C-alpha cells in the first residue's frame with residue numbers, strides 16, 4: 261500500500277527472477293487514463309436535509 | 310590554496326526551488342493522483 265515503493269503508480273503484484281549476483285523484480289501496475297471533465301458538488305439538499 | 314579545489318554542484322538552487330514549487334503546486338491542486 262505504500263506509494264511508489266515498488267512500481268510507478270498503483271501496485272497490483274510482482275514477479276521475482278534470478279540474476280548471476282542479484283535479483284530482478286517485475287512489477288505490475290495499474291494506470292488510469294482517458295480522463296473527462298465534469299462538474300461536482302459536495303452535498304445534496306433534499307426535503308431540507 | 311595549495312592543491313585543494315572545490316567543484317560546483319550540478320543543480321543550482323534555482324532549479325531546486327523550481328522542483329519544490331512544482332511539487333507543491335501539484336499536491337495542492339491534484340491531490341495525490343499526479344503521483
Ligand SMILES: *[C@@H]1O[C@H](CO)[C@@H](O[C@@H]2O[C@H](CO)[C@@H](O)[C@H](O)[C@H]2NC(C)=O)[C@H](O)[C@H]1NC(C)=O
Nearest residue numbers: 292293294295296297298299300338339342343
Ligand atoms: C475542464 O473544463 C475546462 C473548461 O473548458 C477545460 O479547460 C481547458 O484547459 C486547457 C489546459 O489548461 C486550456 O488550454 C483551455 O483554454 C481550457 N478551456 C477553457 C478555459 O475553456 C479542461 O480541458 C476540462 N478538462 C479538464 C480535465 O480540466
